């Protein structure tokens with residue numbers, strides 16, 4: 001299926017390359033002299049899985065209580081002819097009643113953004129019903145992959161949701177479960 | 179199909195973001211004071227499409243006549259919560275009888291690398307026959323997408339091949355056709 005291919009390639013081609021290096025990047029950030037007077041950034045990459053495929057590029061636009069804090073130090077790796085291919089990731093503070101309640105590395109799974117966009121292209125022959133069905137399957141397959149890869153599972157958390165809705169409250173429940 | 183999803187997401191989620199900015203990056207590189215005594219880097223992104231899905235990370239390993247020259251200046255964009263997500267791309271000199279015959283921006287389509295890798299994971303339930311069939315379909319679908327997007331088509335060239343084989347000679351035929 002479309003979802004099976006996307007979930008496996010997102011895992012092999014992105015998560016499997018960044019998750020073994022994430023812990024050390026977070027620790028480097030947390031131990032840096034410019035960051036010692038702030039709360040520690042939580043371990044793990046928090047992956048947003050909107051089942052409606054509504055993927056904005058700016059997280060603060062989807063919820064004002066999600067405030068951009070900083071970028072992690074970048075990771076580089078030679079990848080398929082791209083020398084020093086750069087992996088950047090962003091740190092966000094989660095606000096509860098105007099107060100900092102948590103800090104974590106957060107992003108959306110970009111194949112959910114491309115699934116939404118595919119349904120809009122006449123040439124793709126991909127309906128809104130296809131988009132909905134494949135987005136759910138993408139999330140299920142990604143869960144199945146990560147469950148059987150404990151090394152990858154311990155360094156990430158999948159945040160699935162349907163869409164007043166509070167995205168910050170959803171991230172905070174996962175952040176507090178730890 | 180697996181190939182349909184991967185070709186559309188690679189286009190929407192990568193090529194459509196870098197191809198509108200490539201010309202200006204190449205021109206900036208070609209006009210830079212450190213590069214005026216070298217031959218101009220060709221326009222267009224050259225995408226390697228091995229139909230056998232053999233995707234090495236180092237291009238000089240697949241062919242010694244493909245020599246790394248430099249990285250283009252990076253492009254950054256906010257992407258799905260990743261602030262200043264970095265797009266890096268590499269410039270290679272193509273050697274013919276120990277002599278520089280062409281210079282271009284080159285890389286493999288990374289979904290061909292993930293299709294090869296998928297066939298190796300028991301959990302993916304994806305055979306070597308599936309890998310071969312889907313790799314061909316991925317290449318065909320990517321060609322179909324780019325043909326009907328003239329803005330994207332003028333900034334890239336698809337290099338498909340089956341695998342003594344000379345990868346540099348294959349890139350040079352496309353480079354000289356222009």
Ligand SMILES: COc1cc2sc(C(=O)CCC(=O)O)cc2cc1CCCc1cc2cc(C(=O)CCC(=O)O)sc2cc1OC
Nearest residue numbers: 009010013014079110111114187188191192257288289292
């Ligand atoms: C090889 O397959 C993938 C690689 C990646 S790398 C990646 C990210 O870096 C996440 C952030 C982003 O998409 O910009 C997501 C994916 C997803 C996939 C599977 C879906 C197709 C796809 C390809 C792709 C290729 C990309 C590259 O940057 C090329 C170099 C590389 O793959 O590292 S971004 C991208 C996004 C894609 O879908 C959203």
